[PDB]
């Protein structure tokens with residue numbers, strides 16, 4: 001739940017590449033760290049070209065459509081399961097109809113088009129003559145059902161000598177985001193184009209749905225506000241309503257339909273909340289699998305209720321309602337393989353590692369339950385990881401860091417917004433209401449958080465948080481919104497350790513006792529003191545104890561390192577002279593000090609290697 005949550009610090013990249021990214025993208029070290037990890041190296045990686053991908057079958061499919069168009073063949077388009085299928089059919093129906101095709105959607109012909117996976121057929125989609133990326137060996141792009149519908153319309157335009165159908169990219173982007181596909185490469189380019197087109201969409205229904213929810217150009221608004229309204233219509237048996245909203249040019253009719261989608265989404269929300277309220281209190285503890293039955297539950301809402309349970313629980317979840325079954329899983333437990341282990345009991349089933357579906361006679365539920373519970377018992381418990389980009393910079397640099405991270409957008413399945421680590425004794429704490437919600441400060445940075453039952457923060461905390469630009473009264477404030485918060489604990493990261501932090505007091509005691517020790521030529525005061533006290537002074541490559549940092553690398557060592565408390569070595573804590581790669585140095589310094597204070601051998605060792613480099 002929370003005791004199976006591991007925090008890890010992303011590795012430091014090699015300095016020459018870190019520098020290359022900072023230069024080629026014109027950003028400081030923090031943001032460059034993020035870009036390096038997400039594979040962004042040159043300026044054109046931030047803005048990939050939106051191009052016509054060479055998917056297998058794409059050309060034949062477009063040729064077929066050109067024939068259908070010219071010969072006036074009757075085209076029927078199918079795809080209404082969710083936002084991805086609906087936006088994809090809206091693209092093909094509007095697009096082909098704009099070219100003079102006799103096309104119509106099929107909500108349950110000479111050519112049949114099916115979106116999201118005589119009479120010729122084109123199965124033009126993605127999801128698990130078929131046009132599909134996976135058929136294209138070595139193509140590293142993951143377009144969705146709507147993405148492929150868009151590519152197909154584009155392939156046809158190319159054949160017809162027409163320009164790229166960019167006005168359809170907003171519909172395509174909505175389906176892409178809704179499908180939760182990785183937002184990189186072609187998908188990143190498509191989404192950037194489409195998100196930009198929504199405010200003045202050629203499709204009045206989409207523009208109106210977007211305004212209704214307060215759209216401001218963010219992928220996250222599509223994911224949490226737009227797509228759910230569209231999906232609710234379908235989950236509730238009114239997919240035609242959503243499809244029609246995307247096809248009409250009559251603003252009044254669209255306005256009315258937006259009202260309808262709002263009502264369907266409110267219904268979905270109500271049912272979902274009642275199901276979760278009834279189910280969440282059940283069979284959850286430390287069971288290897290949560291398996292619940294809700295005889296009269298609505299099959300249209302159990303999928304989300306299952307994901308919500310899995311999230312509160314960090315366990316695979318299987319729900320059965322009215323003989324239909326849904327599975328959400330994670331970690332090393334495959335959803336569909338768990339169903340496979342109990343397949344003799346099912347009427348039918350299918351799916352993948354994280355989600356699966358089935359049908360089954362509810363009378364077999366107890367048997368189904370023991371079986372899947374046993375399947376899950378064969379595996380280690382699932383664990384959640386929180387990936388930390390780096391230690392948060394000083395307050396004075398937050399605005400610039402924030403503006404530099406901006407280019408990473410759109411955030412999504414592909415590149416989640418980065419999380420920074422903050423550490424310290426909270427101060428100026430102040431509740432907000434009567435529970436969880438509160439605010440406090442760490443090293444002058446204000447952080448907002450929902451304290452997991454307890455309230456009152458330990459004397460020292462660790463925070464994984466999002467750097468936020470909060471506006472109010474026409475003014476901006478750079479703060480941190482905590483996603484996770486805890487008493488300091490195991491922290492993953494760093495390289496194979498060779499340098500082991502030791503408190504200055506302990507180090508000096510051993511040095512006075514005669515332990516072979518190294519004191520750097522710097523801080524002549526420390527050196528003088530050492531000499532002026534009888535320390536057994538040695539060069540770093542031979543002393544197993546250090547009171548400071550050597551100027552150049554000394555590897556194949558395994559040493560204990562102390563800096564001080566008033567030592568000059570510790571004076572790597574002085575504020576710099578910003579802007580240039582002085583900030584790279586500053587990042588390394590803050591890392592060194594942090595890993596030193598936390599006695600973290602791996603991070604300190606890693607940081608020390610970067611330290612030798614940033615000085616070469």
Ligand SMILES: [Mg+2]
Pocket residue numbers: 084085116126127144145179
């Ligand atoms: Mg899809």
